[PDB]
Write a protein that binds this ligand. Sequence first.
Ligand code: A1BIA
Ligand code: A1BIA
Ligand code: A1BIA
Ligand code: A1BIA
Ligand code: CU
Ligand code: CU
Ligand code: CU
Ligand code: CU
Ligand code: CU
Ligand code: CU
Ligand code: CU
Ligand code: CU
Ligand code: CU
Ligand code: CU
Ligand code: CU
Ligand code: CU
Ligand code: CU
Ligand code: CU
Ligand code: CU
Ligand code: CU
Lengths: 124, 124, 124, 124
Amino acid sequence: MGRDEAGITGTWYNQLGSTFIVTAGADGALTGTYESAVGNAESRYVLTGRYDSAPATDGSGTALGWTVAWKNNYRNAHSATTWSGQYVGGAEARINTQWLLTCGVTEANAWKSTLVGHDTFTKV
Amino acid sequence: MGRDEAGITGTWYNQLGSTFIVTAGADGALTGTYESAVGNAESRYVLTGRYDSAPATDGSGTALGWTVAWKNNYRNAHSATTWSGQYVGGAEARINTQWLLTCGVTEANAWKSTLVGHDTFTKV
Amino acid sequence: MGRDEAGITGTWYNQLGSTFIVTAGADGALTGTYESAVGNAESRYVLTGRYDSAPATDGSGTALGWTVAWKNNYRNAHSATTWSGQYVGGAEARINTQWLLTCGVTEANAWKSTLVGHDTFTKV
Amino acid sequence: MGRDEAGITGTWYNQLGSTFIVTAGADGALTGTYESAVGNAESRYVLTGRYDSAPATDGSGTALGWTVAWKNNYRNAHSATTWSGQYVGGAEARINTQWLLTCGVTEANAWKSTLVGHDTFTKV
Ligand SMILES: O=C(CCCC[C@@H]1SC[C@@H]2NC(=O)N[C@@H]21)NCCCN(CCc1ccccn1)CCc1ccccn1
Ligand SMILES: O=C(CCCC[C@@H]1SC[C@@H]2NC(=O)N[C@@H]21)NCCCN(CCc1ccccn1)CCc1ccccn1
Ligand SMILES: O=C(CCCC[C@@H]1SC[C@@H]2NC(=O)N[C@@H]21)NCCCN(CCc1ccccn1)CCc1ccccn1
Ligand SMILES: O=C(CCCC[C@@H]1SC[C@@H]2NC(=O)N[C@@H]21)NCCCN(CCc1ccccn1)CCc1ccccn1
Ligand SMILES: [Cu+2]
Ligand SMILES: [Cu+2]
Ligand SMILES: [Cu+2]
Ligand SMILES: [Cu+2]
Ligand SMILES: [Cu+2]
Ligand SMILES: [Cu+2]
Ligand SMILES: [Cu+2]
Ligand SMILES: [Cu+2]
Ligand SMILES: [Cu+2]
Ligand SMILES: [Cu+2]
Ligand SMILES: [Cu+2]
Ligand SMILES: [Cu+2]
Ligand SMILES: [Cu+2]
Ligand SMILES: [Cu+2]
Ligand SMILES: [Cu+2]
Ligand SMILES: [Cu+2]
């Protein structure tokens, strides 16, 4: 199995109150759903990503990333967010991320297409 | 089908000479392989992502994103990159992205865990 | 005077234990010194920046930014960090930032020149 | 003098058609004005920043950064941009940057406060 397959798989919550439901596969896959507490979003969106299934054993975190395109059966916000970060195990397990949200825009507006931020996910 | 299913599917090349091989599914999925011309990487890595399969029709680009975890059968760089951007169709089709590369690090080094950059992909 | 001239001027501390000493001028200027608890840095470095001296009065934060080039009389790390963020007044005043650290590198290494992160500064 | 004092001082133009007028001081200071071809901006804005006045001599670029707060006598966009990058000398001298634009927002909107992008400046 991936070293942190069981540690990563499950339900996570960020500081905005969003809900990140993920399954980590033995092959390095991340699959699941994302529900954002903010923005032009309602209900669950498909996500997919990858993680390092054989991380270092020196106390370093486990690198990972995932994408949500903000289209589902309810809404289409013509945008996608990618989260890049690491899982940190332990009693207070965390996934610490930085993210890039890109909106589909015309070429004249490309300069203002991308938001950057940071989300921390916990199991509680 | 996704509006830009055929436009996105195929082989793309960025300004570093890296090769991005992707299939866009009707459901919004991106699957394929990435081969980086630079860094701690050799041969192909699995990628997965998402794209807006019903973009706006006002000339705006098509938002998308994908992730590579830098582990394959040859090397493990304990890191993952996410690319966030948009596909722009036309005679000179492009995927314009910004990216976040996170390395698995100890908590004392978390402040220096993440690189940011920008890649432009073309069909030639 | 700037609306938050007095609120911004003073000594601030971030989550790494770094010390940000700043004077906000009536004209929108920020001047002062930065001392980083981490990285290739020792003692104080010159900083300069700008802030919105007439912010909105609807509860929004006060936008600002500053730069440190990491050369002083002790060390030269051939790099510069810019912090971009906002000051949020109140009992628990904060400056919330995201930052970009660029290292001087050869053109072959330009893709790995820039780190991104986020620092929160408090008065305690 | 700074190694690239003369190389940096002058008028620069980016890919959007914006105009960056800068003087590099022997002490590492950057001062000047910025005029953006895009966004909520008109005429010139004050800028200030820092650069490495004693860069490496191995062909590496010269790290630098600067800030503009988007208030002048004509408009106040309640925002600030920081550019972080490097100057690359030679026949086709360039300043390659990544930038963070933060808007002053209420705490409920802090997640969408910051844009990220990249500008390349040339002498022509
Ligand atoms: O909301 C969305 C989809 C939901 C995004 C939720 C984000 S993911 C990163 C973060 N972690 C999280 O848990 N939740 C948030 N996609 C278009 C994102 C439009 N803006 C923001 C909201 C909005 C809704 C309606 C009308 C205008 N805005 C982005 C701001 C912006 C920046 C630059 C130019 C123009 N607009
Ligand atoms: O290379 C990797 C995997 C390959 C990454 C390729 C990147 S994806 C974004 C971009 N688009 C692309 O087409 N190609 C590049 N993963 C660890 C990334 C270590 N550094 C860089 C190289 C290196 C190799 C060996 C030893 C040291 N470095 C990152 C620099 C850094 C930043 C902060 C702290 C420490 N190190
Ligand atoms: O430390 C510096 C100057 C100090 C930087 C302090 C940072 S500002 C943002 C943050 N807020 C803060 O309060 N403190 C930190 N400038 C070169 C920054 C080299 N690396 C990190 C340390 C290091 C010291 C010696 C040898 C190798 N590293 C950056 C990692 C990197 C990324 C990509 C490619 C290569 N390296
Ligand atoms: O324009 C400004 C000041 C000018 C900014 C110019 C930028 S600096 C980086 C770049 N290099 C350059 O040469 N030129 C551009 N400051 C508020 C920036 C509001 N948005 C964009 C324009 C706008 C004008 C009026 C109404 C709405 N927009 C930012 C988009 C955004 C993102 C997230 C949430 C909400 N909005
Ligand atoms: Cu290893
Ligand atoms: Cu973080
Ligand atoms: Cu948007
Ligand atoms: Cu705006
Ligand atoms: Cu639509
Ligand atoms: Cu771009
Ligand atoms: Cu690394
Ligand atoms: Cu380093
Ligand atoms: Cu106003
Ligand atoms: Cu922040
Ligand atoms: Cu460095
Ligand atoms: Cu490295
Ligand atoms: Cu040196
Ligand atoms: Cu760049
Ligand atoms: Cu804004
Ligand atoms: Cu918006």
